[PDB]
């Protein structure tokens, strides 16, 4: 496509330049172009890809919530609120579909087990985002749960309980149980278990990522504090 004539390494450079400029749509476009070169991503490249897209859909979700709340209080008139909400919703779905397509078409393979946990977590996250706006839907919920579950099973076996990706996966999966599948008890259990088992084996923390483990473990408590 539009990135096809550029060197892979330049695309990676420009992705980093866009991040510094806080141009996350450009950042995602550069990383997508790099993935389409056909080469497996390094750990660093995976996380650049995730940062870019998660930042783009994050703003779309925030926007969508603002309009959905207005639309909800409008129903208690004019079609303009629904129309604009629908416009932002259709946009959000386009980006989610763009990422999920990239995951099945290119990234999810064959590859190592850590690789697979990373991508499978993204699969569950972006399916969760589509479920947040869908109706008619539970097909999307099942595929979010299945992607999450496979990611959990692999990570329990292949990664220490303090690994930031493993901790982040459980955090997000717990939220999925709560806000999506309507299972607060399962959401609470998974978050308490995840936090407790990380403390039991606190010694597995890594010099290169212990700050990310500390933060996600506080977030697990923040959600528990929020759900009591």
């Amino acid at each position: 496509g539009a990135m096809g004539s550029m060197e892979r390494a330049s695309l990676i450079q420009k992705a980093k330049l866009a991040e510094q400029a806080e141009r996350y749509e450009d950042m995602a476009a550069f990383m997508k172009g790099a993935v389409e070169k056909g080469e497996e991503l390094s750990c660093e490249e995976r996380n650049l890809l995730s940062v870019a897209y998660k930042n783009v859909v994050g703003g779309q979700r925030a926007a969508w919530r603002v309009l959905s709340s207005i639309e909800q209080k409008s129903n208690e008139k004019g079609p303009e609120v629904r129309e604009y909400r629908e416009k932002v919703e259709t946009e959000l779905q386009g980006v989610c579909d763009t990422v999920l397509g990239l995951l099945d078409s290119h990234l999810i393979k064959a590859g190592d087990a850590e690789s697979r946990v990373f991508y499978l977590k993204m699969k569950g996250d972006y399916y969760r985002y589509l479920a947040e706006v869908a109706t008619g839907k539970k097909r999307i919920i099942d595929s979010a749960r299945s992607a999450y579950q496979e990611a959990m099973d692999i990570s329990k076996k292949e990664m220490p309980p303090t690994n930031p990706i493993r901790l982040g996966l459980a955090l997000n999966f717990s939220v999925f149980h709560y806000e999506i599948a309507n299972s607060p008890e399962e959401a609470i259990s998974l978050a308490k278990t995840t936090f407790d088992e990380a403390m039991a084996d606190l010694h597995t923390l890594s010099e290169d990522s212990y700050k990310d483990s500390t933060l996600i473990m506080q977030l697990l408590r923040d959600n528990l504090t929020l759900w009591t």
């Binding site: 997000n172 939220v175 977030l219 959600n223 759900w227």
Partner: peptide, 5 residues
């Protein structure tokens, strides 16, 4: 909303 990463 709760925390995600």
């Amino acid at each position: 909303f709760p925390a995600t990463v």
